[PDB]
Amino acid sequence: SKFGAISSVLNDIFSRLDPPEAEVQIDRLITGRLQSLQTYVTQQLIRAA
């Protein structure tokens, strides 16, 4: 999932954009993936209980 970014591939962003706004795109991707992993960990904890 692109999570609102222009592409869902890290290397594609790095090879297609310059650092100044590739930074923003990568920030969006990282925060989305981190949120998803946090959610998974939360349900795992609940099911463990």
Binding site: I6, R16, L17, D18
Partner: protein
């Protein structure tokens, strides 16, 4: 870029470029104040 007569804005022209290597360095020999505004791709490294 070096055509003698560009079409009117309302009846704008359309051209297809294919099956060729594109070198964008040449385009920097134009008039000194050409705006080169690019959306979605960094103009500096368009050659990769």
């Amino acid at each position: 870029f070096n055509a003698t007569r560009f079409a009117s804005v309302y009846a704008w022209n359309r051209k297809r470029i294919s099956n060729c290597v594109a070198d964008y360095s040449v385009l920097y020999n134009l008039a000194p104040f050409f705006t080169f505004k690019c959306y979605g791709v960094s103009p500096t490294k368009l050659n990769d």
